[PDB]
Write a protein that binds this ligand. Structure first.
Ligand code: ZSG
Length: 330
């Protein structure tokens, strides 16, 4: 089997991407944030504290004839950005782009933090990291991909995120028309539960490529590109007037600037992030200071190849017995 679904930016800045997902019988379609950095499929629901719902579409398990409460199971998750959610667990039928899994754990939120409440466009998350990170207790549950994998034509999914435009998540096949050149594959460590890999270096604009190992994670659920302070300083030094602002929480730059590209290495291959992809717009409405899309990972403890990087590539998440990642230009 295969599946194919369009993923759409939630706003004009590509702050996140949503993909429609069918849950239950009859189907309830929710728009979920597909997140290769986490491993829980959780949704706003009829159980979510009413004051914490503000425009989201909710899953109502009592209206699904295939929903079953998973006895005694609870979940609770905190994301690196300070947000959190928790609740109980059903199993139900879940379909993405025509690919169906029966018995998928659907984590129903009883509580969500304010950043989720304030995101009316995101109805929940669909985790695509390794199932060792799943938070369901006392019995850990499998991700949608892990449940689907045996049925897929090939044990893979691909992320093709758009810049200011829709893109695609495919399951079970590699669309050879969706990229240029070849796909370069690179080793993955699953020891922290992430799609963790080592970039071979970087360049800023037309500058020399710096060969240096950068360990990080391929994370569709993180918007920005978080890299070591040395690398980030080298990038922003090429933007007149850019500075790191402690009050704003990162590098900012004059909105009148034209940003240089940023290149990262995948083996001997190179992925070029156009400068425009690094502009996240005014820090506050009407400001002429703009927020940068490349930020330091120093506070984080891990480098993160988020949407800013991944949207410049066609990315293969190969879930074979020994997982690997593939990157192509597009
Ligand atoms: C019981 N087992 C051993 C652990 C259960 N899971 C975790 O400890 C865990 C930590 C994170 N996540 N799960 C998922 C969201 N996170 C992140 C971090 C970075 N990027 C993203 N997208 N999510 C951080």
């Amino acid at each position: 089997s295969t599946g194919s679904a369009t993923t759409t930016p939630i706003d004009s800045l590509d702050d996140a991407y949503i993909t429609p997902v069918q849950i239950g019988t009859p189907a309830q379609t929710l728009n979920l944030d597909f997140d290769t950095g986490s491993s829980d499929l959780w949704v706003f629901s009829s159980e979510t504290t009413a004051s914490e719902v503000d425009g989201q579409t909710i899953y109502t398990p009592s209206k699904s004839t295939t929903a079953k409460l998973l006895s005694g199971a609870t979940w609770s998750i905190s994301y690196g950005d300070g947000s959190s959610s928790s609740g109980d667990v059903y199993t139900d039928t879940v379909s993405v782009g025509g690919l169906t899994v029966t018995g998928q754990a659907v984590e129903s939120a009883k509580k969500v933090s304010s950043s989720f409440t304030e995101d009316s466009t995101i109805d929940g998350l669909l985790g695509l990291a390794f199932s060792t990170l799943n938070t369901v207790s006392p019995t850990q549950q499998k991700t949608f991909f892990d449940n689907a994998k045996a049925s897929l034509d090939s044990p893979v999914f691909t992320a093709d995120l758009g810049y200011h435009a829709p893109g695609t998540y495919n399951f079970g096949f590699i669309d050879t028309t969706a990229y240029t050149g070849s796909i370069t594959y690179t080793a993955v460590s699953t020891k922290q539960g992430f799609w963790e890999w080592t970039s071979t270096g970087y360049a800023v604009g037309s500058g020399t490529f710096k060969s240096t190992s950068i360990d990080g994670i391929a994370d569709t659920g993180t918007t920005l590109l978080y890299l070591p302070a040395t690398v980030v300083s080298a990038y922003w030094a090429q933007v007149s007037g850019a500075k790191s602002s402690s009050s704003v929480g990162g590098y900012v730059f004059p909105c009148s600037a034209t940003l240089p590209s940023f290149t990262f290495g995948v083996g001997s291959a190179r992925i070029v992030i156009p400068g425009d992809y690094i502009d996240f717009g005014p820090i506050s409405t009407g400001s002429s200071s703009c927020f940068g899309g490349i930020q330091s990972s120093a506070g984080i403890g891990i480098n993160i190849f988020g949407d800013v990087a991944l949207k410049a590539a066609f990315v293969v998440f190969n879930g074979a017995t020994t997982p690997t990642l593939g990157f192509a230009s597009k």
